[PDB]
UniProtKB/Swiss-Prot annotation, chain A:
GO MF term (any one): interleukin-22 receptor binding
Record gene name: IL22
Coiled coil: none
Gene Ontology BP terms: acute-phase response; inflammatory response; negative regulation of inflammatory response; response to glucocorticoid
Similarity remark: Belongs to the IL-10 family.
Subcellular location: Secreted
Gene source species: Homo sapiens
Residue range from the parent sequence: 39 to 179 of 179
Protein name (record): Interleukin-22
Glycosylation sites recorded in the entry for this protein: N16, N30, N59
Amino acid sequence: HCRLDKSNFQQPYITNRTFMLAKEASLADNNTDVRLIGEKLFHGVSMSERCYLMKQVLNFTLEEVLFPQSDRFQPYMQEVVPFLARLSNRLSTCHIEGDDLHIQRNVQKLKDTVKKLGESGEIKAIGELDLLFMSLRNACI
Amino acid sequence: SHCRLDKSNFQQPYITNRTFMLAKEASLADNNTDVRLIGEKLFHGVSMSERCYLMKQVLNFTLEEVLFPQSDRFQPYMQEVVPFLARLSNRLSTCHIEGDDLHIQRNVQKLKDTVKKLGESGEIKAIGELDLLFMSLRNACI
Amino acid sequence: SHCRLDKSNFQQPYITNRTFMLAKEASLADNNTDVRLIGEKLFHGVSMSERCYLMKQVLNFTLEEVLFPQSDRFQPYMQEVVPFLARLSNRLSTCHIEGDDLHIQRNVQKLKDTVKKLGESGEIKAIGELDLLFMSLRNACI
Amino acid sequence: SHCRLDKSNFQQPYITNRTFMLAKEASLADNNTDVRLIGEKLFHGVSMSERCYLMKQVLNFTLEEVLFPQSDRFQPYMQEVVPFLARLSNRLSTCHIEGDDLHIQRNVQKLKDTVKKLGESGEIKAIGELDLLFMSLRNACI
Amino acid sequence: SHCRLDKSNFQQPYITNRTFMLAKEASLADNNTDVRLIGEKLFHGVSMSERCYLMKQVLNFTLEEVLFPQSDRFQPYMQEVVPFLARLSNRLSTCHIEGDDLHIQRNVQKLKDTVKKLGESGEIKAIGELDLLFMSLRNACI
Amino acid sequence: SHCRLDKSNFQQPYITNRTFMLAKEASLADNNTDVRLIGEKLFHGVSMSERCYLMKQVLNFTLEEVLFPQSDRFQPYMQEVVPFLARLSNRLSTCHIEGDDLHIQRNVQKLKDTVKKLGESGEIKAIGELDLLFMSLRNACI
Ligand SMILES: *[C@@H]1O[C@H](CO[C@@H]2O[C@@H](C)[C@@H](O)[C@@H](O)[C@@H]2O)[C@@H](O[C@@H]2O[C@H](CO)[C@@H](O[C@@H]3O[C@H](CO[C@H]4O[C@H](CO)[C@@H](O)[C@H](O)[C@@H]4O)[C@@H](O)[C@H](O)[C@@H]3O)[C@H](O)[C@H]2NC(C)=O)[C@H](O)[C@H]1NC(C)=O
Ligand SMILES: *[C@@H]1O[C@H](CO[C@@H]2O[C@@H](C)[C@@H](O)[C@@H](O)[C@@H]2O)[C@@H](O[C@@H]2O[C@H](CO)[C@@H](O)[C@H](O)[C@H]2NC(C)=O)[C@H](O)[C@H]1NC(C)=O
Ligand SMILES: *[C@@H]1O[C@H](CO)[C@@H](O[C@@H]2O[C@H](CO)[C@@H](O)[C@H](O)[C@H]2NC(C)=O)[C@H](O)[C@H]1NC(C)=O
Ligand SMILES: *[C@@H]1O[C@H](CO)[C@@H](O[C@@H]2O[C@H](CO)[C@@H](O)[C@H](O)[C@H]2NC(C)=O)[C@H](O)[C@H]1NC(C)=O
Ligand SMILES: *[C@@H]1O[C@H](CO)[C@@H](O[C@@H]2O[C@H](CO)[C@@H](O)[C@H](O)[C@H]2NC(C)=O)[C@H](O)[C@H]1NC(C)=O
Ligand SMILES: *[C@@H]1O[C@H](CO)[C@@H](O[C@H]2O[C@H](CO)[C@@H](O)[C@H](O)[C@H]2NC(C)=O)[C@H](O)[C@H]1NC(C)=O
Ligand SMILES: *[C@@H]1O[C@H](CO)[C@@H](O)[C@H](O)[C@H]1NC(C)=O
Ligand SMILES: *[C@@H]1O[C@H](CO)[C@@H](O)[C@H](O)[C@H]1NC(C)=O
Ligand SMILES: *[C@@H]1O[C@H](CO)[C@@H](O)[C@H](O)[C@H]1NC(C)=O
């Protein structure tokens, strides 16, 4: 069962940090065509499965994007990662009954895009932490 | 003229805390929560450069159709945050874009509709998200 | 913490092709072929759950003692493959096992010995085996 | 024997992308990602010269027992990659080995067994690894 | 013709034991004693090379008109054996003969008739003979 | 003085598999694929109730003039199947029929003649038909 308490998204300090990190990383992004978290990602996914979908994206973002580039974007990274990780932890006892193929297919497209763009693909992801934060909030509360 | 605000605009004393406290308070009263206003959809088809203009539209709507009309409620928070947002709106009044703003207006339209359809509670939900509107303004315009 | 690499790391055609071509390039220059570095003996006595850790060691050694000292040769493959393998080695830093890693270190040691003893061409053999390293990382860590 | 495909066999326009897409699609459906088919073990006791023959055996099995059957699922990828692999199998007709192929057959046997024992999902896992099979074919036969 | 299943299709003895257990269970309920389905007559006028095709017809009929309606009875055996036989049928969809199949169709007709004429019990007798059908399939198609 | 074999004799997976594999082995060595020892002509004019007795004769002949003399061939199948068939032939030695067995002996004779005339390969053909002998004994005697 996937739900996150809204209180997680209402603290001024950490919210500001997460958004400044997104700004920082985006001021170093060049792709003006591809948006990782957008309409295509949620396409064909019911409201009730969106939090589960976001769980995948968050896991990927911590694992293959944030944990890597830790030596960068200081001192934002140092505060934001623990926070996102706490959230990813809460969502581990969260699953869905049905078929998650269409969902995994959507996430796959995002994972592909990041790996293909390599180094900067990770930069783009971090530049989108503001959309990640908004998506987690809307899908999980 | 241009679409941008000096970072000093978002460093004024305790404006951020107040805005979040206001949002928290109004959130307590938000019955309908299966419906969100600010989020991923709002940005569909909008480039990084256009975001500040998009946020300008949402801020203008929020002030005129939501904040000035509920200015008597959620005190004393309301009184401290509104004037600040009003000045911000004024500072952005010359913010414009060249291309077509059809996508932006269609997105904003969806937000106005949701707020209008929910009546009094639509106004509450809008205030309950001033924190995200504010952080989005900061990111888009500095 | 845990040892895991996302499968997306091993599903990109371009870098996979490069890593395999580099292995082919280096193998077309290996004279010795009477001892396989990555084989049955390396994984013998190692549980499935500890294989990724084991591969962590072998990858560290391959980057450290084999790939950097060689960065010069096998162009332009080496120039693309090394960064890629490095990123993976980086990710596996958080990879730790609780129990005793003596049998594991023993096995890795045997591989390190063989490469050092064959000297110059030992490093060539290792690079010739990147395809097996890539398959081994993929199977052990996803 | 004549185990040598012309390097032109592996440069077809968008064949590589298709094969990887097919493997990605099928991978999504692989529950036993904790069981592996292609990898280090498949090559035990097989010399560089014999690898192309070994891959020939694996390719033949994959086509006859996995692809030619499950041919309806995973469209449109399946229809673009199979015909190509069938021609490759045919092209490997002039490929044989002189010595004893007992080790090679025992290795291939392990692969066939795993695929058969897992029933339908065994077929899925095989397709989920066409990428590694294809890259191993290229390496072994050019 | 494309009838020559890989021997691995019939080498997961778990499946063999299950098929015989299923046959034993259904045999207990076979009141009818005079009539038999599988045996010498079924092969009249069929050459060794044609037997796999003949068995394919019988297997297709047994799956569609027998194992499907009784799928709820004889648990848990039924659930373990059917899927396996279905994959086999599928795997044989790619098997045909050139010459005239009139002798074969006449033989299969005699089997279908016996099964249909006996109604519900004809289905039971058919299941009671899955052991002989299975061993005949193995012999004809590998 | 009854002719009967318990069905349990024909429902054991291990020995059934062996008997059939032995028939496969011996048939892969039969050239004359243009003659059927156990077929329509053998049972022609024989009532259901006398079929077991008829099979008793054929089994005795197959053990005596075909399997015992050929005990060195087709290992290791022969070593397991012959004792099995022998136990069954032993059980049937009391099996008798009251009436006239001229037409029956006439039919068996034709089978004996054919095998002896084809000499060495006639015995091979017989062994290649053990699967039909097994099915015939089962249908006639249970
Ligand atoms: C008909 O019977 C055969 C043979 O039966 C087996 O062998 C006899 C002598 C007795 O010991 C019986 O108890 C056995 O059941 C069956 O084929 C054998 O099947 C078994 C298990 O299904 C196979 O063993 C597997 O071997 C795998 C490794 O394969 C390699 O090693 C074997 C061993 O010698 C070798 O023969 C083969 O060529 C490979 O080199 C291993 O991974 C797995 O765990 C298991 O141990 C055995 O290999 C098969 N033998 C052969 C050559 O057929 C049939 O399954 C059975 N048919 C049916 C439909 O029931
Ligand atoms: C978002 O945070 C920035 C920076 O955070 C400040 O420094 C951190 C190390 C930490 O100590 C935080 O508590 C601080 O707020 C804020 O910008 C700073 O604001 C202070 C006072 O307002 C000022 O003295 C600094 O120079 C500013 N540093 C800059 C230019 O980044 C910013 O106000 C916060 N945003 C909002 C709207 O709340
Ligand atoms: C192999 O492992 C060693 C540690 O055993 C890694 O060394 C670390 O290197 C970083 C700088 O790159 C230092 O900050 C750490 O302090 C080092 N750790 C130790 C043990 O001191 C090394 O980076 C690894 N090699 C690769 C490239 O994977
Ligand atoms: C692996 O990448 C190489 C790139 O080096 C591909 O080979 C080149 O392909 C282009 C376009 O078809 C040809 O014009 C060149 O002749 C090739 N270069 C060389 C020197 O080989 C190759 O196709 C890729 N391999 C696979 C299997 O996709
Ligand atoms: C086949 O039939 C013959 C005769 O019908 C059996 O021969 C008998 O064998 C016993 C035991 O050795 C002797 O005491 C009898 O005198 C034999 N009778 C005849 C007519 O010779 C033989 O045992 C049978 N073989 C099998 C295995 O069925
Ligand atoms: C049994 O045999 C029939 C005919 O050989 C098989 O084919 C029928 O069903 C298929 C389903 O995919 C169709 O694609 C075929 O066109 C259709 N053919 C006819 C003439 O109806 C059927 O799949 C077989 N079933 C089994 C159990 O193998
Ligand atoms: C991410 O997912 C893996 C398994 O897919 C899990 O083991 C790991 O703990 C997760 N990390 C988080 C909470 O992001
Ligand atoms: C909104 O925009 C209108 C002009 O389109 C302007 O007159 C009005 O004052 C604005 N609202 C605020 C408070 O900025
Ligand atoms: C596979 O091998 C068999 C046996 O040699 C051969 O008859 C068949 O044509 C081959 N199939 C493929 C797909 O190459």
